[PDB]
Swiss-Prot record, chains A, B:
One of its GO terms (molecular function) is identical protein binding. It comes from the Eukaryota. Belongs to the PPR family. P subfamily. It comes from Zea mays. InterPro entries: Pentatricopeptide_rpt, TPR-like_helical_dom_sf. Keywords: Chloroplast, mRNA processing, Plastid, Repeat, RNA-binding, Transit peptide. Forms homodimers. It holds the Pfam family PPR_1. This is Pentatricopeptide repeat-containing protein 10, chloroplastic. One of its GO terms (cellular component) is chloroplast stroma. The lineage of its organism: Eukaryota, Viridiplantae, Streptophyta, Embryophyta, Tracheophyta. GO terms for biological process: mRNA processing; mRNA stabilization. It is found in: Plastid, Chloroplast stroma.
Length: 702, 702
């Protein structure tokens, strides 16, 4: 409009006021008039008026005639580039092959390249770049920079970057601020620490002057690496060479350590800020608290929170929701409530995220008490319960077994009129699984079914769990049958439920069914199968299952080896249990616990080999394991069983000379064995060294 | 046999040689003869011969006659207790109510109680205990100890424990070794630190002498708490008061810290051992390495490994498998291979767990190279590939996109004859999803179907993914239809696949279908829905989706707020994008990144408000964010668009006085705006301050 001759101005206006889908026609309606235009000016005008899609349309049309040429293509490529239209550019260029490089100008392509880079479309970025290369186009600084960025984001492309810089230097293209920053960040992304440091050094030796940008980038590399010392040196260099670390610099550092997982570092940083009169953010405080959080460190999170509050900072809903979720992870019930108490009084009010956060706990004792308290709170201040808040509620109640409460909220939800969906129903099905109440559960599935829903594989899992806890083998068998006429969450549940009922057939079958879809039996399953094969006496089968575990790749745990040792103990083969114990002893990655020792000890008594059981007890004490009184009574009664009264006493004297004190039953047991062996004088003697017992003896003799 | 009169000895032998299911009959066949026996001696004899089930049978029979009495019930309860038969005891006692307490002896119940405790059957343990209480039976030391243990294991039962000890003291029952150990461990389990310390103190003031057991327990409490200082004091007390820490003590400490998550502590411990001439284990070394591992600290894990190897320790397969899995978690490809190289030469040979471990990685560039290397290795030394090793292989290859290699291993698997199952097929379906090869995928589903398998919901997810990447809206629509005539893994996949095809209808429908089963839309889904509603121009709908996110409880992230700001920028409402930017700025838990700033800046240029975009650029630089060259070119060209040439220069001069250097395009752009405004003298002046550009200008004027 400001550079077109008047006639051409009417042409452009007439084109740009034509609807797109049929522009072709009208264009053809002025072919004679068009092949005379400077088509490049026309495209330009369309770009400057917003009609890029029209520009593309015109170029595409002019291409099928003579009218297309190099300056036109570059005008549109530059246009769509600046317009951020990478899809359409890529399409355009796939339909074409660029003119000789002589009539190319790299500068027209930068924006497109950049637009591709920012869209994560890296392979296209590099195809465009490759295409330019094929035409002998010499890249310029900016072109280099963008390509470098593509490589950096891509990852694991260090050799190519170094090659790229080599080529940059050979062409006498001197790196600028962006070059350095980009290369260094390309390094931080991967953890190319020594490579970044090397590059920085080169950059310095070649007498280039690093700016805030490159320092800040270097800081990012060491920040993500958790390289403390080197980061402090970078800060020192910033100080010496003009820049001079900020509150911003330290905040980003601490923050970057913390987000990378290095909290101890981050906290060291906050320490330094604190000593230097530097003001931490809120976001950084929170970030270090999430570091301590994730890792598990809660107390130190909360210590940091108190610190945050001491310095007058007033935390908001999101910060409190953050700490709350952190505590939810653990299950800290009481301090959760203390914090919620703190928010109200504090001054901000919980939103739906807070509620959903506190009610997204599970765990042990105290949860229904907790959830009740949270209900009290939620009503103790506005908070309209949405149809979704009910599900959070019923699910929380259902997660302990508070059936009464779960159904209470369910009615409260039905009263206030609501269309309780499926998660509600599974929440109920979930509460029913403690009391093995398949009856009410079935009923629930009926209601679900008719009101036209369709039971989740979760529903079916919960029902299975219900029949199991309720001894109802029938319903489990029936569901099985339905299943073989089909998930994994269901199959696994079947192995487990049949196991809880000692029903081997269904265990065998559902295992067979999991292994059929060449799946991945999971350790729990395997431990189960070995367990059942042990209890029914099929020992070569459970050996076969162990072999099955070790075969694939999975490696057994304590529950496994303890299952084994126990089976072997049951078979009077308490030597094989011992061999396994010893294996564990020198496993390097596993140690045995009290159960494995008690299995070997109890087994060696049972098989009569009490001497050995004593040696294993001695070892158990040697590796710093502490036996209960019943185990001592077990080996004492073992010795007694065989008239070995001297060693029985030895055990007891060892018990006393340690502040243990043996069960009354133990003295009794020795006395009983004495009295059956007809060694009454002896028993009396035993009582002399060590009154009801005496009375007993006297009764036994006369 | 050694206490029965001869006639009674024939009775017992005749009973115990009778088959169980019908014993009743024979028993009844000697009722007259039985009601005269001392039935208690008979049960005892059956216990001493192994026939406990017979003992139970006799008691049960004698119960339905007169013959049952208190000593008989206690004989069998004691028997099944010692025999570890808690199920049958519980059953027995549910069928009976105990005689007056006068004829009770607590000692008969200990084993049963203990057996319940060790089976995790705590509520039954406490019902038996409650039942004894109902008869005024005075518990003894051992009874107390077992009950305490039940409470300890149960959890969150501190007040009850303290009550229990109160009652112990009132009855003048003086705690022993087990009492103290149990109470303290009951504390460690929960983290009742100050409570444990308090108890220990009381125990000391009352002049009781703590033994190794109680010290070791106290050490466990502080170990699990991560309480370093206090643990060192406990060690000091052990030293002063007879015990004297061991290599065992320190090993268990370090180990307990490490398993509790407190690696820095654990490593401090190993440090002390090292200084005290104390020998660390292997298992403890490994445990600290898993601590550093989990938390993410790999390097320090490996530093610890070198330490482990330096001290002559020779690590085994499990230790190498441990370190390997740790590295697999990250994706450390090269050091993984260096370690595998190290094992071979080391001296031990990889097992199936090693293989399954190295091939259980996923990730970015380098993985197919890696997996090839691992194949080379696996063949470079025996290692028969099982039908399962193939699946691990094909799946690893399939995880990058190495289709050629995936099918190569698949053929290798078919050649060696094998019945490739389902996971194999999904592995193939998985590789096909990069190249959008729904054709071969369909084919695969055909082979799967006929050879009589049944496609996983995973299969269906992979196929969906294949149609999506391949632009094939048709197959996606068809699958949809099949689905509505049904998982979540499928529904989510549908929302995502339809989104990848910009097919709003199916997105709306599958969302509707997820929200129908009152489920849990997930952030990714929501971000999608908002994205699509932005791109089709339905802005009040995407507002409604944001409201939907914040409603429930979920809290939005950067992808969300950036989606929003971007939509607002598209609407020329770049003020609302700014309001959101500022919100983020003071969010406390979120900060904005480069994308959000570039959205606001680019939007304010687009809407003409370049002044504002400049202020937001200024802020972007203030919070330590670094812009690329294209953003500068964007605001420069913004100013230029409106003849504001003074400020355009300002931007450029700021670029230079920072080591940035502006794109060639930028100078060009200023010049273009000058030349359209007809300010040619001015443009020449601009070139004077700041040759092709001059040439251009001259061309433009004449």
């Amino acid at each position: 409009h400001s550079f077109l001759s008047p006639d051409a101005q009417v042409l452009v206006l007439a084109i740009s006021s034509h609807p797109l889908p049929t522009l072709a026609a009208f264009l053809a309606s002025r072919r004679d008039e068009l092949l005379r235009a400077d088509i490049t000016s026309l495209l330009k005008a369309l770009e400057l008026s917003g009609h890029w899609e029209w520009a593309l349309a015109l170029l595409r049309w002019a291409g099928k005639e003579g009218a297309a040429d190099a300056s036109a293509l570059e005008m549109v490529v530059r246009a769509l580039g600046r317009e951020g239209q990478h899809d359409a550019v890529c399409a355009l260029l796939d339909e074409t092959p660029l003119p000789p490089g002589s009539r190319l100008d790299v500068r027209a392509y930068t924006t497109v390249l950049h637009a591709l880079s920012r869209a994560g479309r890296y392979e296209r970025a590099l195809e465009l770049f490759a295409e330019l290369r094929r035409q002998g186009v010499a890249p310029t600084l900016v072109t280099y920079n963008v390509v470098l960025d593509v490589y950096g984001r891509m990852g694991r492309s260090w050799p190519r970057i170094v090659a790229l810089l080599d080529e940059m230097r050979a062409a006498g293209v001197e790196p600028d601020g962006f070059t350095a920053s980009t290369v260094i960040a390309a390094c931080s992304r991967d953890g190319l620490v020594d490579e970044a440091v090397a590059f920085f050094e080169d950059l310095k030796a070649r007498g280039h002057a690093p700016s805030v940008v490159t320092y800040n980038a270097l800081l990012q590399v060491f920040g993500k690496a958790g390289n403390y010392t080197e980061a402090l040196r970078v800060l020192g260099e910033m100080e010496q060479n003009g820049c001079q670390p900020d509150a911003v610099t330290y905040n980003e550092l601490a923050g970057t350590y913390a987000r990378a997982g290095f909290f101890e570092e981050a906290a060291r940083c906050l320490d330094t800020m604190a000593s230097k009169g530097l003001l931490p953010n809120a976001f950084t405080y929170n970030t270090v608290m999430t570091a301590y959080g994730n890792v598990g460190k809660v107390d130190e999170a909360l210590a940091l929170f108190d610190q945050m509050k001491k310095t007058g900072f007033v935390p908001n809903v999101n910060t409190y929701n953050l700490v709350l979720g952190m505590l939810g992870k653990k299950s800290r019930f009481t301090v959760m409530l203390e914090m919620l108490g703190e928010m109200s009084r504090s001054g901000c009010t919980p939103n739906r995220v807070t509620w959903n956060t506190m009610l997204a706990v599970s765990g042990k004792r105290g949860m229904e008490d907790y959830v009740t308290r949270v209900l009290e709170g939620m009503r103790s201040s506005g908070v309209e319960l949405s149809r979704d808040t009910y599900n959070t509620l019923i699910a929380a109640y259902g997660r302990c077994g508070s059936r009464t409460n779960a159904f209470k909220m369910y009615n409260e939800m039905t009263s206030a009129g609501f269309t309780p969906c499926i998660t509600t129903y599974n929440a109920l099905l979930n509460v029913l699984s403690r009391q093995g109440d398949w009856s009410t559960a079935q009923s629930i599935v009926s209601k679900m079914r008719t009101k036209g829903f369709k039971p989740n594989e979760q529903s079916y899992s919960l029902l299975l769990q219900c029949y199991a806890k309720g001894g109802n083998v029938a319903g489990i068998a029936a569901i099985e049958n339905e299943v073989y006429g089909p998930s994994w969450v269901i199959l696994r549940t079947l192995v487990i439920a049949n196991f809880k009922c000692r029903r081997l057939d269904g265990m065998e079958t559902a295992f067979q069914e999991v292994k059929a879809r060449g799946y991945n039996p999971d350790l729990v399953i395997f431990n189960s199968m070995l367990s059942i094969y042990a209890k029914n006496g099929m020992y070569s089968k459970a050996t076969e299952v162990f072999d099955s575990i070790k075969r694939s790749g999975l490696s057994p745990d304590l529950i496994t080896y303890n299952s084994l040792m126990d089976m072997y103990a049951k078979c009077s083969e308490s030597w094989e249990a011992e061999k396994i114990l010893n294996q564990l002893k020198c496993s390097q990655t596993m140690k045995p616990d009290v159960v494995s020792y008690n299995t070997v000890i109890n087994g060696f008594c049972k098989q009569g080999l009490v001497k050995e059981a004593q040696r294993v007890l001695s070892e158990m004490v040697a590796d710093g394991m502490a036996p209960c009184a019943v185990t001592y009574h077990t080996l004492v009664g073992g010795y007694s069983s065989l008239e070995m009264f001297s060693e029985a006493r030895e055990v007891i004297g060892y018990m006393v000379q340690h502040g243990l004190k043996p069960m009354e039953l133990t003295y009794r047991r020795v006395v009983e064995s004495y009295c059956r062996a007809k060694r009454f004088e002896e028993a009396r003697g035993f009582l002399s060294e060590v009154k009801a017992l005496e009375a007993y003896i006297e009764d036994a003799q006369f």
